[PDB]
């Protein structure tokens, strides 16, 4: 049970890191494009 | 025991990815602000 609970919580952590990476990728891409456009 | 050890090591990996995401977020934010300011 403890191991299952740990995996469950770690999956939530993974989902949070994925959210963060997706937002950072969009933001860096927007900056790269801004600089190209300028 | 093996599963516990794997979870423990994976938690350290998660912590490392969190460190990295936090630093990248700060750095992209600083760039976004620099460009806004310019």
């Amino acid at each position: 049970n403890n191991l299952l609970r740990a995996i469950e919580a770690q999956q939530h952590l993974l989902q949070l890191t994925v959210w963060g990476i997706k937002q950072l990728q969009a933001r860096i891409l927007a900056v790269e494009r801004y600089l190209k456009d300028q | 025991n093996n599963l516990l050890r794997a979870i423990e090591a994976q938690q350290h990996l998660l912590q490392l990815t969190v460190w990295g995401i936090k630093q990248l977020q700060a750095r992209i934010l600083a760039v976004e602000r620099y460009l806004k300011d310019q």
């Binding site: 403890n2 191991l3 609970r5 740990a6 919580a9 770690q10 939530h12 952590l13 949070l16 959210w19 963060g20 | 516990l4 979870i7 423990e8 938690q11 998660l14 912590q15 969190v18 936090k22 977020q25």
Partner: peptide
């Protein structure tokens, strides 16, 4: 998701991390 801030993100990360620590500690006893 689109309604979440980076401060909230850090809070949620911290909360799950602390929970996992507690679970792993209890697995040792």
């Amino acid at each position: 998701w689109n309604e979440m801030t980076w401060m909230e993100w850090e809070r949620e990360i911290e909360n799950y991390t602390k929970l996992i620590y507690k679970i792993l500690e209890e697995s040792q006893e």
